[PDB]
């Protein structure tokens, strides 16, 4: 039954485990997801100009 | 007889060193037991501890 307890101690140790990377993920991604809409929108503003300034020089 | 009154006495004396070592070689036993048990979810509780703390680290790595 010493062997019982070791068996016990697995139990925990695997199912948090499980579950706590199993949401780790899931969050963080949807952070990054959220992140990823906002820098595009950065992006909206500073697009029309970029493309002038990049228009003018390689004319001549 | 006293003589013989003395011969029971003592081997019965006797009788009773035998199972006093009897019982602490089933003492000694027990309490080993006892610590190896102790010792042995010592070593499992450690690692499994560590197991985590780590795994959990790969999470954030991703």
């Known amino acids: ?60 | 007889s006293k003589l013989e009154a003395i011969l029971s006495q003592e081997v019965e004396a006797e009788i009773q060193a035998l199972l006093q070592e009897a019982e602490a070689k089933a003492e000694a036993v027990k309490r080993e037991a006892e610590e190896k048990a102790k010792a042995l979810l010592q070593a499992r509780e450690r690692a499994l501890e560590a197991q985590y703390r780590a795994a959990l680290r790969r999470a954030e790595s991703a």
């Open chain 1, 1 to 60: 039954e010493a062997e019982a307890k070791a068996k016990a101690l697995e139990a925990q140790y695997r199912e948090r485990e499980r579950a706590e990377t199993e949401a780790l993920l899931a969050r963080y991604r949807e952070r990054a997801e959220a992140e990823a809409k906002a820098v595009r929108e950065k992006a909206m503003a500073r697009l029309d100009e970029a493309v002038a300034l990049v228009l003018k020089e390689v004319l001549p």
